[PDB]
Amino acid sequence: DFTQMFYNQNVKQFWLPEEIALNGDLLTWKYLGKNEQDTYMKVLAGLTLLDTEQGNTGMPIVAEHVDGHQRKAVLNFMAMMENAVHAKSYSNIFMTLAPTETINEVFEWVKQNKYLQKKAQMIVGLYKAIQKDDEISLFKAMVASVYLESFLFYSGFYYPLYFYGQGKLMQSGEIINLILRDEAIHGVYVGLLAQEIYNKQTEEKKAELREFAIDLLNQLYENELEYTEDLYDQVGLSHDVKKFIRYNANKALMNLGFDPYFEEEDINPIVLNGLKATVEPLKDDDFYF
Amino acid sequence: DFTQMFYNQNVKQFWLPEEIALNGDLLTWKYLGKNEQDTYMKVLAGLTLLDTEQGNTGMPIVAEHVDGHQRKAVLNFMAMMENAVHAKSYSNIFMTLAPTETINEVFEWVKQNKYLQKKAQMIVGLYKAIQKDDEISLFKAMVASVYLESFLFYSGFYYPLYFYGQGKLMQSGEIINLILRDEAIHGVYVGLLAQEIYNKQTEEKKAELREFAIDLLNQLYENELEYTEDLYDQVGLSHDVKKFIRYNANKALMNLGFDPYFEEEDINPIVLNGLKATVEPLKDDDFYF
Amino acid sequence: VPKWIQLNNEIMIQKDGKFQFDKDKEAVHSYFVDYINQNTVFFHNLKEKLDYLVENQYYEEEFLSLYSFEDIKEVFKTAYAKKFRFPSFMSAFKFYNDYALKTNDKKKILERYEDRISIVALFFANGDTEKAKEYVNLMINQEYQPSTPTFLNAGRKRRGELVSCFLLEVNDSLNDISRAIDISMQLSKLGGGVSLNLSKLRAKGEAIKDVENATKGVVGVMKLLDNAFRYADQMGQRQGSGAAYLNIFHRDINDFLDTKKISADEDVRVKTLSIGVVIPDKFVELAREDKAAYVFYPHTIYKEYGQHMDEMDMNEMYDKFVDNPRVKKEKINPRKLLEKLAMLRSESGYPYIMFQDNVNKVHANNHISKVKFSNLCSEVLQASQVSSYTDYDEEDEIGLDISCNLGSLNILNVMEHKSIEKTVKLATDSLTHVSETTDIRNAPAVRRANKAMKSIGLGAMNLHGYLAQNGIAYESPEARDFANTFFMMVNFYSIQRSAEIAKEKGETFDQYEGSTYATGEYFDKYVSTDFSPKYEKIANLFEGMHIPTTEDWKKLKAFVAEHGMYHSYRLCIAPTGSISYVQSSTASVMPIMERIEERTYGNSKTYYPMPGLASNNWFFYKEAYDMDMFKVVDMIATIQQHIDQGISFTLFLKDTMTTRDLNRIDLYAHHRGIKTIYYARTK
Amino acid sequence: VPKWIQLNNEIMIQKDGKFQFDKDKEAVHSYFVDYINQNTVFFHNLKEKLDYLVENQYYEEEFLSLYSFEDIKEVFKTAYAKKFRFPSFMSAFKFYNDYALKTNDKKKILERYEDRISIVALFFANGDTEKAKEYVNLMINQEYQPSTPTFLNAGRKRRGELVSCFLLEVNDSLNDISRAIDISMQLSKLGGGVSLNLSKLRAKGEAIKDVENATKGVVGVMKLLDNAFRYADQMGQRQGSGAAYLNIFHRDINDFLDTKKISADEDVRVKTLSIGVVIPDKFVELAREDKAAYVFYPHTIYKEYGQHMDEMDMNEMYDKFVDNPRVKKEKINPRKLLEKLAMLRSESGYPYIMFQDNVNKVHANNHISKVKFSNLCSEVLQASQVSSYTDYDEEDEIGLDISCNLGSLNILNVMEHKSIEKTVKLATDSLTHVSETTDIRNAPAVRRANKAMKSIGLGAMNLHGYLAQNGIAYESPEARDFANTFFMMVNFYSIQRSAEIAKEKGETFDQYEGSTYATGEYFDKYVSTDFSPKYEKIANLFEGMHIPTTEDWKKLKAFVAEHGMYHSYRLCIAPTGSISYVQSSTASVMPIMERIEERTYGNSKTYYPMPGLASNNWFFYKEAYDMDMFKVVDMIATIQQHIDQGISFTLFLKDTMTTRDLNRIDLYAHHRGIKTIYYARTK
Numbered sequence A, B: 001d002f003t004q005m006f007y008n009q010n011v012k013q014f015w016l017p018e019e020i021a022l023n024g025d026l027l028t029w030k031y032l033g034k035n036e037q038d039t040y041m042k043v044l045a046g047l048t049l050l051d052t053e054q055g056n057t058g059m060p061i062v063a064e065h066v067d068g069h070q071r072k073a074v075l076n077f078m079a080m081m082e083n084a085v086h087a088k089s090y091s092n093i094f095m096t097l098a099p100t101e102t103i104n105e106v107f108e109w110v111k112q113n114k115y116l117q118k119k120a121q122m123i124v125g126l127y128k129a130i131q132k133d134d135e136i137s138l139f140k141a142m143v144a145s146v147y148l149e150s151f152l153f154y155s156g157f158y159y160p161l162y163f164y165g166q167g168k169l170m171q172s173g174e175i176i177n178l179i180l181r182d183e184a185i186h187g188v189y190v191g192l193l194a195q196e197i198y199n200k201q202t203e204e205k206k207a208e209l210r211e212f213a214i215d216l217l218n219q220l221y222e223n224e225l226e227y228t229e230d231l232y233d234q235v236g237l238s239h240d241v242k243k244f245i246r247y248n249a250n251k252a253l254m255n256l257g258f259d260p261y262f263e264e265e266d267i268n269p270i271v272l273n274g275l276k277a278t279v280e281p282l283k284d285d286d287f288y289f
Numbered sequence C, D: 001v002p003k004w005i006q007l008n009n010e011i012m013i014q015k016d017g018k019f020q021f022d023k024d025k026e027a028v029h030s031y032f033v034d035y036i037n038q039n040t041v042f043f044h045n046l047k048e049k050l051d052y053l054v055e056n057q058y059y060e061e062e063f064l065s066l067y068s069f070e071d072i073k074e075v076f077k078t079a080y081a082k083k084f085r086f087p088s089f090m091s092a093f094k095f096y097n098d099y100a101l102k103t104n105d106k107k108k109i110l111e112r113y114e115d116r117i118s119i120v121a122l123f124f125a126n127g128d129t130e131k132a133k134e135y136v137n138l139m140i141n142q143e144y145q146p147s148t149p150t151f152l153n154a155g156r157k158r159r160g161e162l163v164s165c166f167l168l169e170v171n172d173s174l175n176d177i178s179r180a181i182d183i184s185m186q187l188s189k190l191g192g193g194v195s196l197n198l199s200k201l202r203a204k205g206e207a208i209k210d211v212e213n214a215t216k217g218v219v220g221v222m223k224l225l226d227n228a229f230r231y232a233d234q235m236g237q238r239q240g241s242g243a244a245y246l247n248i249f250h251r252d253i254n255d256f257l258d259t260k261k262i263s264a265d266e267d268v269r270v271k272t273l274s275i276g277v278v279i280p281d282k283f284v285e286l287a288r289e290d291k292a293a294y295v296f297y298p299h300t301i302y303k304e305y306g307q308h309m310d311e312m313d314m315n316e317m318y319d320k321f322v323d324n325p326r327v328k329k330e331k332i333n334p335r336k337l338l339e340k341l342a343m344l345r346s347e348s349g350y351p352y353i354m355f356q357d358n359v360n361k362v363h364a365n366n367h368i369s370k371v372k373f374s375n376l377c378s379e380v381l382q383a384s385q386v387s388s389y390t391d392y393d394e395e396d397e398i399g400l401d402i403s404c405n406l407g408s409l410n411i412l413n414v415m416e417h418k419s420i421e422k423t424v425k426l427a428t429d430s431l432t433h434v435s436e437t438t439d440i441r442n443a444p445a446v447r448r449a450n451k452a453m454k455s456i457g458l459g460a461m462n463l464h465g466y467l468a469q470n471g472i473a474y475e476s477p478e479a480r481d482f483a484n485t486f487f488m489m490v491n492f493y494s495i496q497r498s499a500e501i502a503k504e505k506g507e508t509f510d511q512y513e514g515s516t517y518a519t520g521e522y523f524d525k526y527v528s529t530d531f532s533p534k535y536e537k538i539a540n541l542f543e544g545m546h547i548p549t550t551e552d553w554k555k556l557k558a559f560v561a562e563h564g565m566y567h568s569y570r571l572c573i574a575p576t577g578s579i580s581y582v583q584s585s586t587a588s589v590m591p592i593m594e595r596i597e598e599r600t601y602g603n604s605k606t607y608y609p610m611p612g613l614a615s616n617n618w619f620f621y622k623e624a625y626d627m628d629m630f631k632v633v634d635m636i637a638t639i640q641q642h643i644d645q646g647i648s649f650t651l652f653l654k655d656t657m658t659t660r661d662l663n664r665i666d667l668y669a670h671h672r673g674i675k676t677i678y679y680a681r682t683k
């Protein structure tokens, strides 16, 4: 009942980072403190890693196991967006704002950062555990994918949105909003596929799947807290970002058909502000009047 | 040396089925004989069936085994074009020209056809034989992929190009020309990835891979001749189609860095009408001698 | 956001279901109370102002030295005695942003509307204080408006040329092509739009010094001209604008047209070069009968007959070209070519269409030459002779290159003052003065034709505005009756003024004796057909003004026979792009595109209602796209029967209509006697 | 495949581990016994052949009319008495495909090698039968080779111009820019490569009559010239080739260079116009000291000083430019600019590098003008005066635009015949004749400079061939000693012939009296330093020939002082691309790129071994890429000390080396006195 409308929405949202000129951010970037620039680079690098694996591994593997040519076409399109559009856009931002050495250093930093490695290990592990014709392993990977789309990106998205909302780094911010618009529909779509599998189960099996989903969310959440503190303490925003990731965790649960898990909190209003012609032949009667 | 350049060319060639209005083809379709309509339907179904294998298996399997983030992104983009763009385009052409019952029957016929099946299963067999961390099996699959993209499609493309060059079925011919333009670049790109593997091999292993490629080409070519007579004798075109197959076989070989196999031939004119050195800073004392 | 901009944007805010048009007036007041008066440089007296402007190289000393200071002060006082007020914000904004003289730092206003009008009048009169006061009364009543070049640059030392429409003939040689490129660059440097005829150039695949398949065709020349026009862009102020015209029987016509296709490659497409196609009656006859046509290689025709393909009548020459084995030609489908023209006009509005026989069956100077091409705006239609630019240290054969003098009557202001005769004669005198004071030292044929032909273009504007403010639909037969009568009077008084100038100066234009004016043929339809209004409403509109009858036309014909005519060409209706804003008028004789137009200046939005638009005349201000293009063609043909040159005629199409409808409009224009079709603007 | 093609491909099929070079000879035999003799057109006698070639507009009858038919028969018999045989298949193939005269349909061969040589000799002699026989013996022995234009077009009716290269000075004006475009198209139509100095054009963001930031800079003129050269492409046979030269102190120097970047946008990228950069010693000094340099706006300098920036010495005026507030300048890093030059040359081989001070420290005609730019091959270095092309109907001030006639000595054949003196004098006479009979009617400055300067270019080929066939390594000091002695002899006999021509005609070149030839300064190093070979092997190589000593040079200096010199410039070493094949010679004085070159013609492939390549001299034919570029620079400087103009010095680089290595090679070339650097070809 939904794939065709998602197909149409995905293809109509198609974009490339080159559509957005980035040289306009040069001055507002220059004006940020060293702490702010550091957090910003690292945040986008963490996002780049997530999209790299979502494009290389997550979306293609889910596409392989989901039945139906139209469902596969949507998932293939989403996969392309992840690595050919989203992951690449971050390099466009980096290449504009930062010198090569700072770019090299931040990519080295992703490799050695323990929270980023842990979250990649956990998510990719679940993708690679999918067994052919085994719907339960597929469900588990789809939960992981929804958590990546609708929860894990948000510790990263906070900062570009926070600046956009203050009228700073607005070209980079425009790119990020386009990425976010895509991930929102990706999270909903994968969520609907996960619910399909969940709804086939006995009540006993469903109870276990909810346990899996909640245990996984909590494990990812605890790691994300440490990641958030590590990045945001130097810019004074860790508590604010934490509220934002809890907000989005609830959206991820809802995408999976589950009740919200965290209590509602006031999000920084700055971040909320951050959101040819038809041809006929000539008749012989058209030459006479 | 080449992936970013191909990335650029691929994404700038992006298109959607909806861009070409198909209904005006009915004004020339109605004037074709039964044999012409039959051949066109059968050719179209042949292309559709082969392209589906490439979208579901060929491109995604190669993307899975190739190392490199940028290569995986380009390959993902190509897989997207197969599944999201090409497959929808073929379906659109069919739905415009034939009623539902006729489409189902043509696909039943072509699905049972000996020559279409022989080539489809030969290609799919090589994709299924790729082994993790074995570059020889990957190379063999890449050869199969290049043969599909740059050679096997062309016994089929001939007919729409033949009409397109005569002013018949111009809307569907425009679509086919866009598809063909994508398959050409797909073949060239996968060809470069195969040459990379080939160049890492010993001289004895190279000679062995050359023998594999020529042997495979021979098997496919002999089946193409039979496929060609089966479809085109009823419309009197087989001689010219055979010249077009050999010409495209030579292009496929050149994509794989191999010499042409067949002597140069002229092609039907109607179908033709249708168709950084390392920067090192000056260290001073380089101005003194 | 400034206060005047808020008052202007308050127009769209509807009160009692009606647009607040009157608020626009308030905006003007604000625009003068807050901005214009604050940033206008004031002097203790006019003597100090004139001294400051002359000394700081703003004005020219020569034209001011012809008057005593008392006469200049009297002219300025006459200009200021009208107490002219801009009725809409956009009029004053356009004048003070485009035409008012500003300091070198572009932060202060040195010229008001009255100051600019007085300076232009003093330049026009050339030493006559009474004539200067007459010009001041003409322009402050806004009856006549000099073109943007004349209005902006008259009396200014730092200025371009007062002529901005130039037509060049390019002969089939490398020397002539290089000279055409040079002249195009020099005229674009002067600020003029340059049109080049490329029909004499041999097609692609022709012989150069008896070596085969050597010529690049007209497309390479178009690439060269496009680069030249990109380079010469008014010292980096406006984008260099050029036009290329090719006969439809030239073989390159497809490649020519292919320069405007979106799918064209970078080595084929020209972006800053407009294209126009000249369509003889023979092509229309071939398309009508569906007979396959032939596009000819111009150099083979030149070798066989000694004359260029575009220099002879294709109606009598086409069969001889086809039957001549020594003339090389290619088979084409004329209906396919017409469909290609319609498709290209739908995509980009190109090419301009020139109906050669429609122009030349009423052309008065066919003895000098037949009109082979038009200008960048497709309204200048004059005889031109190609020049033979030879090698260095060799004398060139200088021909005639068209450069007419633009100026527009405001039909509403002219007719409400009952001053058709006086306005037409004064505008003719001003155009004659500007043509005589034009001296271009880098375009020899342009200068020679300006000296010889003395051709001017007197246009009209605010036709739709006048008709709508008088309760007349633009497509109504009453509107066509009014246009017929008004433009017949304009032609009558223009011919009378030309003959009077010829009698006073004792000289006519070169080769006048062979013209239809001299033989009296031009006046035939005027001495037999009465052009008085056939409707009582139009006659009441013309009340208080003498309408020339057949006897008056006979007297004018006798006067022209006795005394001659000073101007080879007198009337041409230009688009009148930005001067229509300052005059608070609708552009040209075209119907309005929008009732209220929304524009974006800087980061601010502005709203311009059409002049005189209100609730009572909202229906009469019908938009051009909603109109029947056949009736617009009928009105333009009615006007064209009284205009010696062409009319800038833009087609206004809806996105729903196809290329068949565009071709039908073009063929009805050809049938109705339309000389040129300018643009195909799709809504 | 043809039999000769198989025989030529049999070279690479090794027999007993060695290449079958002798098979090449067999190929030529086949190529003559199966193709050339069958495709040749034979007549009953020479009279019928000459008549057929004259009436059929193949030959000009004027140069043949100066001889009785008996004399022409004697000249042809002298040409055929040598029984010349092409030693390699590629020599004959290149002659009969590029230089032998064919019919109108190009189906048969009308000219043999002896016929072409006889016609060229008869054209050279200008009515002298003995001189014609001397030229025949000089060319059939292959001691001297006229340039491709002269050799191909001499005595032909359908010929182009005999001058290979033209150098134009472009003044800073729209009239001058348009005239430069016209002259470039005219000279490309004539077939010659055109070089334009854009250093006088004001940079981007300069004022055109008090309106600032108006100029498009040299990039707009570059685009115009690129389109002009694209349009004028030798009637579509050979792509139009142009060169633009800009001083490195021009403000546009970066944008200039950005025209050749592979990532450049289409509005900036220029693809058919080669680029050259003129580097004064001041720029190298600033880069060496790492002091930030300043690029200058030419128009501000011209306004302040009255002279162009490239019209005066930057080494003495750079500080005045920097300290002058009325001069506009931009800060640059000279080392970064050098690295950009090296990167651009690595990527595309551009720009050409002209070390201005290296050219002008030994330039003999600095009084006329300093050398400010080079030609398309970066070997012509002559004084040029810019022309003032004024408005139409105004007289133009015609300057001097460089143009010289090319001709190459075959070093191997000249030294084998022990005829340096005779070959040099006869080549000088032939080049003087080519200059005298050259008259270009569309390039006035080129015509005036040809008439006044009388400049010729006498080059040399087969330096590496002679060295390798004599067992001398090209990088060895013995090779440099041979080059020193041989080119000192060439310079001595060229000066002697120039002075003898001046004596026999009673006229020198214009402004010779101010030259270093007249003052005797030019002969300083020749009257104090002995250039006889320092090695016994080289002295033995020069046996049988009188090597000029300091006494002979003193006598020549006295002779020049008494009689003057006919030619302002005499020696320039062109690349000699395709005519080196016919002469069986290595290209120019450059080392060979490869021992055996595989070239694809049609659907076949051919292998050309280097002339004289064999087992015993395989390693003496060292490939240029494998050579030390510093020793090649040493060789080129040794030759350059005896060449008044420049040498087309191509750098041969490996892919492994960095841009720092290229910069080091460039700086060593500048240190060693290299005047120009042609190309950076990377293996």
Ligand SMILES: Nc1ncnc2c1ncn2[C@@H]1O[C@H](COP(=O)(O)OP(=O)(O)OP(=O)(O)O)[C@@H](O)[C@H]1O
Binding pocket: C028, C029, C032, C033, C037, C084, C085, C086, C087, C092
């Ligand atoms: N609509 C307008 N068009 C042109 N100028 C205007 C307009 N409105 C105001 N001005 C300028 O501002 C001045 C002030 O005009 P205002 O409406 O205040 O009264 P006024 O009686 O015309 O004034 P003044 O004493 O200046 O003549 C005018 O003289 C004129 O220079």
Ligand SMILES: Nc1ncnc2c1ncn2[C@@H]1O[C@H](COP(=O)(O)OP(=O)(O)OP(=O)(O)O)[C@@H](O)[C@H]1O
Binding pocket: D028, D029, D032, D033, D037, D084, D085, D086, D087, D092
């Ligand atoms: N390498 C070559 N270069 C030039 N011309 C050649 C060459 N080889 C053959 N020819 C031409 O083809 C003819 C074939 O004759 P070939 O050289 O075989 O010897 P031939 O018949 O004994 O006579 P001769 O050598 O005296 O001309 C030659 O006379 C000459 O005109």
Ligand SMILES: Cc1cn([C@H]2C[C@H](O)[C@@H](COP(=O)(O)OP(=O)(O)OP(=O)(O)O)O2)c(=O)[nH]c1=O
Binding pocket: C189, C231, C232, C233, C234, C235, C236, D171, D172, D173, D174, D175, D177, D201, D202, D207, D208, D209, D210, D214, D215, D216, D217, D220
């Ligand atoms: C006309 C024109 C000139 N130029 C540049 C190129 C020329 O080298 C330079 C000189 O033009 P000029 O032809 O000398 O202009 P000018 O003589 O009227 O101005 P001035 O008195 O200052 O010399 O201006 C452009 O870049 N674009 C243009 O459109």
Ligand SMILES: [Mg+2]
Binding pocket: C172, C173, C174
């Ligand atoms: Mg000619």
Ligand SMILES: [Mg+2]
Binding pocket: D172, D173, D174
């Ligand atoms: Mg000037």
Ligand SMILES: [Mn+2]
Binding pocket: A051, A054, A081, A082, A086, A087, A179, A182, A183
């Ligand atoms: Mn993503």
Ligand SMILES: [Mn+2]
Binding pocket: A054, A078, A082, A149, A182, A183, A186, A187
């Ligand atoms: Mn996603």
Ligand SMILES: [Mn+2]
Binding pocket: B051, B054, B081, B082, B086, B179, B183
């Ligand atoms: Mn496909």
Ligand SMILES: [Mn+2]
Binding pocket: B054, B082, B149, B182, B183, B186
């Ligand atoms: Mn494909």
